[PDB]
Amino acid sequence: APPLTLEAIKDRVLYVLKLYDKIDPEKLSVNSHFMKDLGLDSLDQVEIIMAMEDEFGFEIPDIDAEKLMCPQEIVDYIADKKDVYE
């Protein structure tokens, strides 16, 4: 497997939020804090991190699942959990 890098993560990350129809593409920002500006319900936040979980193939613990909130921070927690540094 080729070394997956942070640029690859974010490209794959915002791909799925753009896919998520309640997150319409135009107002997607790397730091788009979900319910403050996208209005995305926290009960669907627990639904998107498992979408991330199948996207990259691993488990996000519940302790930081509710903490995993910002799309940039989505990438941030992805990188260190797989020591993605490049």
């Binding site: 497997a1 794959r12 199948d54 996207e55 990259f56 193939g57």
Partner: protein
């Protein structure tokens, strides 16, 4: 004294060289896997010549080489017996592991200890070809644990994985239960027949080996993972894929079955013992297959399919069919080994994922891997004129065409139908569907190492039984006049099992959802065996060890009865003796008493 005898022995000495070269440490620390693979390849090519000498002539050797040591009337000697069983198991086992060796390079292209890995495989390989080739019971006993301990290390290849050690500990324990039966047969044969060489045991016609055969049976059940002693083999999936593809697929696990084939002449003389052989094989066939069709890991499916096969093998040895059992060993060696590397192909390529619920659509993604699996699946089910037909279709017809237990005979038919059932489950979920793996697809099988290894085993499975059956001398009684209704049963049940399994599998495509049936809650949990029998007895014996035993006896009672009581008695009366008042009046009064008793009362004067 042809080259047969000499070069059939040198075959063994070939595979020992990679071990010796490795210990020098001058050995090539880079291309060692290539070194050993080619070494096994030459050992295979050498192993042909004894075979081609066999079907022509039919001579089987006994090589009583260097005399180890003599025990009065016992002459324990390293002796190799090149029976028809040994003269053909040697090529097929070498051929399979050579195919595995090529596949192993591709699969473990990143393991840092790869050279150690290949060294372990040879040591296992050495331990087995001295197990199959064993003129005396002692060197047969040599392999019986040499293969077991080699399995332990190989299973625990990923040392850090806590479960892998638990599975590794599980494998040796269940094997060790069988060795109790093994040593029991050992003691009886030496005490009564005064030997361990298989020749003297046969000649001394021990036609009432009640305890010996029971001991042999218990040894087989642990090694071949029968009911009561099965779950270690399904739990042996925590080891790496090529490890399971070789040992716990068609080579190591079949050793237990091979034991009775060695002792078949004494086995048939008794009537009582072979009853529970086919009884044990019968129950093993369901429970392994019954749990097979409900698991969701390819490694779990395939292994349970193996244990169902070894369930079927002992059914054959049940009703006086040893030779067909050994035939089934050879066929099982080809297609079953293929299925694991085929599953290993989709595992590694699809990012080491083993949950059967994540594949689908792999038919077009992996044309060769899908092609290999369906041929293997058909071979396992027993499609006519292809591998399994020459053994399983003969067996199912044979066990039906004999005076057997009625329940045992019905047992095989359900297993054969269930044999197709999980076979469809693999082909349906893994291949015939839509993609379910993570979005990044890294599907790949174009590596020549995988292609050459699978194809090498594939062309072997295609013909397989045709060559062996036509070449070996006719050495079983062939039943001829079968009523057509039961002669088709070998094909009816599997075709029937195909229909319902297919209908049940695509019922998942149906939008309806159902809560778990209690039967599914039973079958899917490995048939309820590991949840109880690995938790209840383990807790009691362990709790007995600490609460009782050590604490109760060793550290409390055994130190109180003898040591502490004497110490307490000595101290309690030492203080009263030493506690004196220091007044002469009391001491002198004691002298007056002492004089009085000594003078008269104690009759010292008279």
């Amino acid at each position: 004294m042809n080259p047969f005898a000499s070069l059939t022995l040198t075959t063994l000495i070939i595979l020992t060289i990679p071990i010796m070269m490795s210990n020098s440490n001058i050995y090539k620390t880079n291309l060692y896997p290539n070194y050993v693979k080619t070494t096994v390849s030459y050992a295979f090519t050498l192993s042909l010549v004894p075979l081609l000498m066999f079907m022509h002539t039919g001579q089987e050797m006994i090589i009583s080489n260097w005399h180890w040591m003599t025990l009065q009337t016992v002459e324990l000697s390293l002796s190799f017996k090149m029976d028809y069983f040994s003269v053909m198991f040697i090529p097929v086992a070498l051929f399979v592991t050579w195919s595995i060796m090529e596949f192993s390079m591709w699969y473990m292209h990143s393991d840092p200890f790869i050279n150690r890995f290949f060294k372990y495989l040879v040591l296992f390989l050495i331990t087995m070809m001295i197990l199959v080739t064993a003129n005396n019971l002692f060197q047969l006993f040599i392999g019986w644990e040499g293969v077991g301990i080699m399995s332990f290390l190989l299973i625990g290849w990923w040392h850090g994985r806590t479960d892998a050690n638990t599975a590794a500990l599980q494998a040796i324990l269940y094997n060790r239960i069988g060795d109790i039966g093994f040593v029991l047969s050992m003691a009886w044969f030496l005490t009564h027949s005064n030997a361990w060489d298989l020749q003297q045991i046969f000649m001394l016609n021990n036609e009432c080996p009640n305890m010996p055969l029971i001991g042999l049976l218990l040894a087989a059940a642990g090694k071949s993972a029968q009911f009561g002693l099965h779950p270690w083999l399904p739990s042996a999936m925590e080891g790496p894929t090529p490890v399971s593809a070789l040992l716990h697929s068609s080579t190591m696990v079949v050793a237990g079955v091979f034991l009775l084939i060695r002792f078949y002449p004494l086995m048939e003389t008794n009537k009582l013992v072979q009853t529970m052989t086919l009884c044990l094989g019968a129950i093993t066939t369901l429970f392994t297959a019954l749990c097979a069709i409900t698991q969701n890991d390819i490694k779990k499916i395939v292994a349970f399919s193996t244990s169902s096969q070894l369930g079927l093998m002992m059914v054959t040895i049940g009703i006086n069919q040893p030779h067909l059992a050994f035939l089934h060993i050879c066929m099982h060696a080809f297609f079953k080994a293929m299925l694991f590397m085929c599953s290993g192909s989709i595992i590694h390529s699809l990012n080491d994922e083993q949950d059967i619920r994540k594949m689908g659509g792999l038919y077009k993604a992996m044309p060769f891997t899908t092609t290999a699996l369906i041929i293997g699946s058909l071979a396992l089910t027993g499609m006519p004129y292809l591998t399994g037909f020459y053994s399983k279709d003969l067996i199912i017809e044979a066990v039906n065409m004999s005076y057997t237990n009625a329940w045992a005979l019905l047992m095989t038919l359900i297993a054969t139908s269930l044999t197709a059932a999980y076979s469809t489950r693999i082909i349906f979920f893994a291949f015939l569907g839509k993609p379910r793996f993570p979005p990044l697809v890294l599907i790949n099988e174009n590596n020549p190492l995988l292609i050459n290894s699978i194809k090498r085993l594939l062309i072997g499975s295609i013909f397989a039984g045709f060559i062996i059956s036509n070449n070996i001398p006719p050495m079983t009684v062939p039943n001829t006049t079968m009523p057509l209704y039961m002669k088709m049963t070998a094909l009816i049940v599997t075709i029937m099992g195909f229909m319902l399994a297919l209908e049940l599998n695509n019922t998942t495509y149906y939008l309806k959802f159902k809560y778990p049936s209690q039967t599914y809650k039973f079958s899917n949990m490995l048939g309820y065996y590991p949840s109880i029998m690995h938790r209840l007895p383990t807790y009691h014996n362990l709790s007995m060890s600490q609460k009782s035993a050590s604490s109760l006896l060793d550290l409390i009672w055994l130190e109180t009865i003898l040591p502490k009581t004497t110490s307490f008695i000595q101290m309690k009366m030492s203080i009263m003796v030493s506690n004196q008042k220091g007044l002469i009046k009391l001491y002198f009064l004691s002298f007056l008493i002492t004089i009085m008793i000594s003078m008269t009362l104690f009759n010292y004067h008279e």
